[PDB]
Structure 1
Amino acid sequence: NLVRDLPQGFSALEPLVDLPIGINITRFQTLLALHRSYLTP
């Protein structure tokens, strides 16, 4: 109901998937959209 918050109840998260990848991961980045496409070189 409130836009700002993470609420103050309790609920737990079920498992979704599990992937056998075998990499090294040290960083990440979100990938969200926009309206006017810009590409940086």
Structure 2
Amino acid sequence: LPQGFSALEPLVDLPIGINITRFQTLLALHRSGWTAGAAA
């Protein structure tokens, strides 16, 4: 993580009204089997 200060712009507001308790990220895989580049 780099140093310095930077504010965060609000982007999206959604009136969904549901319950959220657990989550998981999603990636993209491509076959050349499949190879994935560096990411952090």
Q: Which ranges of structure 1 fall in alignment gaps of 5 or more residues?
A: 1-5
Paired residues, what number? 32
Larger relative CO (CA 8 A, sep 6+): 1 or 2?
Answer: 2
Q: Identity of aligned pairs, percent?
A: 100
Higher strand share: 2
Q: Which ranges of structure 2 fall in alignment gaps of 5 or more residues?
A: 33-40
Task: Report the RMSD for the aligned CA atoms in angstroms.
Answer: 2.0
- Give me the TM-score of the superposition, normalised by structure 1: 0.66
- Give me the TM-score of the superposition, normalised by structure 2: 0.68
Q: Which runs of 4+ in 1 moved over 3 A?
A: none
